[PDB]
Design a protein around this motif. Structure first.
Motif, short mmCIF file in Angstrom:
data_model
loop_
_atom_site.label_atom_id
_atom_site.label_comp_id
_atom_site.label_asym_id
_atom_site.label_seq_id
_atom_site.Cartn_x
_atom_site.Cartn_y
_atom_site.Cartn_z
N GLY A 22 -4.44 9.53 -5.01
CA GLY A 22 -5.44 8.67 -5.80
C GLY A 22 -6.51 8.11 -4.74
O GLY A 22 -6.38 8.51 -3.49
N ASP A 23 -7.40 7.36 -5.19
CA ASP A 23 -8.20 6.76 -4.42
C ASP A 23 -7.67 5.91 -3.27
O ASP A 23 -6.60 5.28 -3.62
CB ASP A 23 -9.22 5.52 -5.48
CG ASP A 23 -9.76 6.22 -6.72
OD1 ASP A 23 -10.32 7.61 -6.58
OD2 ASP A 23 -10.29 5.52 -7.51
N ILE A 25 -7.65 2.68 -1.90
CA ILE A 25 -8.17 1.60 -1.99
C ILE A 25 -8.40 0.69 -0.59
O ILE A 25 -9.48 0.13 -0.42
CB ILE A 25 -7.00 0.32 -2.90
CG1 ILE A 25 -7.11 0.95 -4.18
CG2 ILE A 25 -7.48 -1.07 -2.81
CD1 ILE A 25 -5.82 0.47 -5.03
N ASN A 41 -3.17 1.86 0.88
CA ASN A 41 -3.06 1.42 -0.82
C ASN A 41 -3.85 2.60 -1.65
O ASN A 41 -4.96 2.99 -1.27
CB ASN A 41 -3.72 -0.16 -0.87
CG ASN A 41 -2.78 -1.18 -0.23
OD1 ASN A 41 -2.51 -1.04 0.65
ND2 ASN A 41 -2.39 -1.98 -1.03
N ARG A 43 -4.51 3.81 -5.38
CA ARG A 43 -4.79 3.55 -6.93
C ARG A 43 -4.30 4.56 -7.78
O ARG A 43 -4.22 5.91 -7.37
CB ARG A 43 -6.36 3.51 -7.16
CG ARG A 43 -6.74 3.01 -8.45
CD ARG A 43 -8.28 2.74 -8.70
NE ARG A 43 -8.62 1.54 -8.12
CZ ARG A 43 -9.29 1.39 -7.29
NH1 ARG A 43 -10.06 2.63 -6.57
NH2 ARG A 43 -9.75 0.35 -6.49
N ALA A 109 1.96 -3.40 -10.42
CA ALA A 109 1.37 -4.66 -9.55
C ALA A 109 1.92 -5.48 -9.22
O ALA A 109 1.56 -6.76 -9.39
CB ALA A 109 0.08 -5.01 -10.34
N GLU A 115 -4.31 -5.09 -9.16
CA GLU A 115 -4.34 -3.76 -10.04
C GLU A 115 -3.19 -2.90 -9.76
O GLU A 115 -2.75 -3.05 -8.50
CB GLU A 115 -5.78 -3.21 -9.82
CG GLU A 115 -5.92 -2.84 -8.63
CD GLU A 115 -7.11 -1.64 -8.43
OE1 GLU A 115 -7.83 -2.02 -7.47
OE2 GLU A 115 -7.19 -0.77 -9.23
N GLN A 117 -1.25 -0.30 -7.99
CA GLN A 117 -1.35 0.34 -6.97
C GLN A 117 0.08 0.59 -6.01
O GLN A 117 0.80 -0.03 -6.26
CB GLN A 117 -2.51 -0.06 -5.92
CG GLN A 117 -2.08 -1.40 -5.66
CD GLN A 117 -3.13 -2.25 -4.90
OE1 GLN A 117 -3.60 -2.15 -3.69
NE2 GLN A 117 -3.84 -2.80 -5.78
#
Length: 143
Positions: A22-23, A25, A41, A43, A109, A115, A117
């Motif tokens: 994922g992204d 963070i 971290n 996302r 979360a 959010e 993650q």
């Protein structure tokens, strides 16, 4: 006293897979504003499976680490520990043997995030006398 990047890589090279994709963070290090991140971290939507980075044994499954919410720690061979934080659910118990890629839990979360993650840490103790201290996951995760 802190191990060199060369020692960390020699120990961990090829042993570890991404728990989640994922992204990013936030990545490893000091952000300069004074935030420290002891890991990564990543996302992902709530309920997304979180997979073990390597074969090991569940050393901890609980919520007694402040700000990490539901936490799983996996003990690996040769002084490595991986940490999986902010989980919604845990699919494993203390003392359970797990394989690389096995579902440990689901993205949440829980704790100090706003959010869903995964907070992921890779900790290394060169000997049994040493504390398992955080290492940049970029040293040992695949590209």
């Amino acid at each position: 006293a802190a191990p060199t990047e060369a020692e960390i890589i020699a120990s961990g090279k090829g042993k570890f897979a991404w728990p989640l994709r994922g992204d990013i963070i936030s990545s490893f290090g000091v952000k300069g504003t004074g935030q420290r991140n002891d890991g990564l971290n990543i996302r992902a939507p709530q309920g997304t499976p979180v997979l073990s980075s390597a074969d090991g044994e569940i050393a901890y499954a609980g919520n007694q680490v402040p700000t990490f919410g539901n936490l799983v720690l996996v003990k690996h061979a040769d002084g490595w520990v991986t940490a999986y934080a902010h989980l919604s659910s845990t699919n494993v118990k203390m003392r359970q043997q797990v394989k690389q890629g096995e579902q440990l839990g689901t993205v949440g979360a829980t704790g100090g995030v706003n959010e869903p993650q995964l907070h992921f840490e890779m900790r290394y103790a060169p000997t049994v006398k040493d504390k398992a201290k955080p290492v940049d996951p970029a040293l040992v995760l695949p590209r």
